[PDB]
Each structure stands twice: as C-alpha cells, then as structure tokens.
Ligand binder design. Sequence first.
Ligand SMILES: Cc1cc2nc3c(=O)[nH]c(=O)nc-3n(C[C@H](O)[C@H](O)[C@H](O)COP(=O)(O)OP(=O)(O)OC[C@H]3O[C@@H](n4cnc5c(N)ncnc54)[C@H](O)[C@@H]3O)c2cc1C
Length: 458
Amino acid sequence: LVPRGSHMNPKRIRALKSGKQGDGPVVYWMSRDQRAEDNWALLFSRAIAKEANVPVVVVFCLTDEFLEAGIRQYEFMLKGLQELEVSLSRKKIPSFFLRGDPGEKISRFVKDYNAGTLVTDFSPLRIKNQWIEKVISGISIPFFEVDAHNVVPCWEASQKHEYAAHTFRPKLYALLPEFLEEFPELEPNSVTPETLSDVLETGVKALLPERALLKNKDPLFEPWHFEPGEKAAKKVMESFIADRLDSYGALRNDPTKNMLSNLSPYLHFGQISSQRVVLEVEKAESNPGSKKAFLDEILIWKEISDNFCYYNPGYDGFESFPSWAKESLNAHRNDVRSHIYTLEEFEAGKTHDPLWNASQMELLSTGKMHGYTRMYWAKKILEWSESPEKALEIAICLNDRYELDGRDPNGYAGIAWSIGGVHDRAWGEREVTGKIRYMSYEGCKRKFDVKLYIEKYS
Ligand SMILES: Cc1cc2nc3c(=O)[nH]c(=O)nc-3n(C[C@H](O)[C@H](O)[C@H](O)COP(=O)(O)OP(=O)(O)OC[C@H]3O[C@@H](n4cnc5c(N)ncnc54)[C@H](O)[C@@H]3O)c2cc1C
C-alpha cells in the first residue's frame, strides 16, 4: 500500500515474494536504475516508506562479476555512484554499498537493519534473476520489483514475445497515454535516519592486468568521450536536443557523423530515465522525421529488447532465433566460410576487412561503436565464424567486454537481430548466412564515406 494520491500507477510494481512485513526501513536495492531523479523504483520505495512511517534507504551491491568487464565500465559506474551518494544525501536518504553478491549481502543487510520491505528495480537479464532467487531464499519480508527502466512496464506492454517491431509498436503506442507522464519530485526523508574511492582504487588494481593496450603498452580506452553521472547525462540529452536531433533523421546511419544522442552509456546504467528523455524530445520542435526516428529507437527498439529477454529464457542462444532463421542457418552450416578468425584476431581488429577493423577500433578506443556499424560488425562475425553459435559467443563476448552500454538487453537483442534475424524478416538466400539480412562492404561504401570512418579509427 502507498498513500492515497501518491501518483504511482500500480501496474509498474510486481510482487516477487509475499512475506511478513518488518517494522524498519524500506530498502530499495538499486541495480539497473542508478539515479535519484525520475526513478519509479525509488519513488515507489519512498511512498511505501511514508505509508509505513519509516525512512527509505538505498543499497547497492558491488558484485563479484565486475572482473568480467573492464576499467572502462567500472569507473563509469562508480563515478556515477559517487555523485549519486551526494544526491541521495541531500534528500536525507542514506546509501549503503555492499561488497559481494546480492544473495548473501542483501539477506544479511535486511536482517541487520531490520528492514520492513525490499524493493528492487527491473531487469530481465539472467544474472539479476540469479540474484533474485538467492535473495528470495534468504529473506522473510515482502519483496517487490518496479519497472523503472521502461516507459510501459515490460509485463504490461505485451503478454508475450513479439516477433516484429510492427506487432509490438501498436501495443506500446496504445499504452503511452497511460504510462508516459511526468514524474513527481522525490520527497526527502523526514529526518536523516570503506568509501567508494577506496573500492574504486582496489577494483581498478584488480582489473589493471587485463586492461586493453596497444602494441606500445599505452591504453586504448579514451575516457573523455562520456563523462559519467546524472548531471552529465542531462547535459548530453540537452545537447542532443539542441544540436543533433534536427539532423538525426538524415544522419543516424552515417558513422562519420556525430549525430546520435550518445545517451546509451547513461541509459544502460540508468543514470538518466528513458521516460525523461522521451518527455523532453516529445516537447521539442525539430526537423520533421527526426523525432519519429529517434522515438522509434528509444521507445520501440529499446523496449522490444526487454520484451525479448523477458519472454525468451534463451535470449543469448541460437534456440531463440525464429524458425525461418534456424532452418536457414542450419541448411548452410556446412558451407565453407570465406575466412575464419579467432576471438583474438576479431578482438584486435586483425581481419582482412578494414571497415570491420575500424569498427572494432572505435569500440576499443571509445567504448561506443556507432549503431550502424554495430550491425555490420555483428553480421561479419557470423560470416567469418565456424557456426552461428560460435558467432553469438564471440559477438556477446566482445560487446559485453568493450561497450560501455554492454551487458544489456539491447545488446542481446541487437546481436540476435544481427546474427539470427530476431525481429527481422527473411532476405535473399546466400551461402553461409542463408536468408539472414546481409550488409556488404560495397553497400556501405555506397551509403557513407567508408574511407573517412577508417581514417578516424586507425
Ligand atoms: C550488434 C549490436 C549490438 C548492440 N549492443 C548494444 C548494447 O550492448 N547496449 C545498448 O544499449 N545498445 C546496443 N545496441 C543497440 C544500439 O546500436 C545502441 O543502443 C546505440 O548505438 C547507442 O547509441 P546512442 O545512444 O547514441 O543511439 P541513439 O540512436 O541516439 O538511440 C537512443 C537510444 O535508443 C535505444 N536504441 C537505439 N538503437 C537501438 C537498437 N537498435 N536496439 C535497442 N535500442 C536501441 C538505446 O537505448 C539508445 O541509447 C546494439 C546493436 C547491435 C546491432
């Protein structure tokens, strides 16, 4: 229960576990949505706290899986969290950063701090479901989840996997009048109920030996492309609206032009609300076509990615591909590939294709490959791998290791679109790739200045 007129639509919250309510603070276990503003999970947690006459507190687990990615993501996330600490402190909301995996750490915290209710944000990924299962086994209090990432809650937008954007789109757009709304301000707590710097230091030291380096032993990553945190995210949104949105419709598929929003790293960590971005873009007057194209990406393609992962347990495997694509890829399994590269050769941009290599270098150096070349990149991994299963493994590995926005439903769904035709149709049949949409080098040369892209990233 929340207080009458709290402005919380109950369709945004799902019970994970019934239990017996305790009398202490409401705990928001923050995971996907690393921000204080425009956060329905935090807002719901505050509202339940107010109804129960207790404070809200935030807990975040610094998990054991950080070593599976790089310094680039760890520093981006933790610097955001340092700013978040302050934001939450200004609302008199304490934040606790627990070192370890959620099952042990969240269970113990709930007991030690006498928590009344536990609330988390929503992610459809396997690792969050693993964590939920272990937490559920370790607690006796009620446990809810709130979809703070999507404009329309994932379980409301559709009751099933949607095979195409054109089947999901009408369902989603029909629910915007209900779910696309302004956020209430977060009410502070009535009274105030190892530092992150130390953790960051220790974590970086553990990651240092696996840092991406050029032949010179100088690091590849350039950390000045995306300043982390809530405040920076808002400035990137504003600069997008002011300077890039007008040309987005025309230039979104030109990797030589900096005309995308550049919001993905911030959206991935939830340092900015996609609902906020949509409210601001909807209000803007910009060139015809650009708003339509942008909203299709941040509403339809982003939210269909959650739909995909939520409703397909095997979202990172061949089995989740559509029947037509599985049958087609199987028919061409024994076709001889034109090249076969090792993971190391792919990783280091050592293929015979200079466009592919440049795309990989953009990823290595900036942590954000242009959206258009991501499609090209993943499709060539299918073409130059022993099997579609190996291609998935390779693409996922590199995406997750090097993209700031990686380890994300958008990645799994984008890779599945690219390699497996998920959310696509059948195209002309070719050897090796069957009926999976093909993106040729020469097609790219016709579409944009390939030589310039290659010069930029070599
Ligand atoms: C092989 C492959 C891998 C990808 N890996 C990821 C990933 O790991 N993480 C990730 O966030 N996106 C991924 N994408 C989707 C997309 O390429 C990025 O979201 C986009 O390039 C991010 O840049 P931007 O924010 O400047 O994009 P903009 O064009 O400004 O779009 C704004 C936002 O809309 C959403 N969006 C845009 N395009 C897509 C799309 N095709 N699918 C789903 N959502 C979209 C994203 O949240 C993005 O931040 C992948 C796509 C492919 C083809």
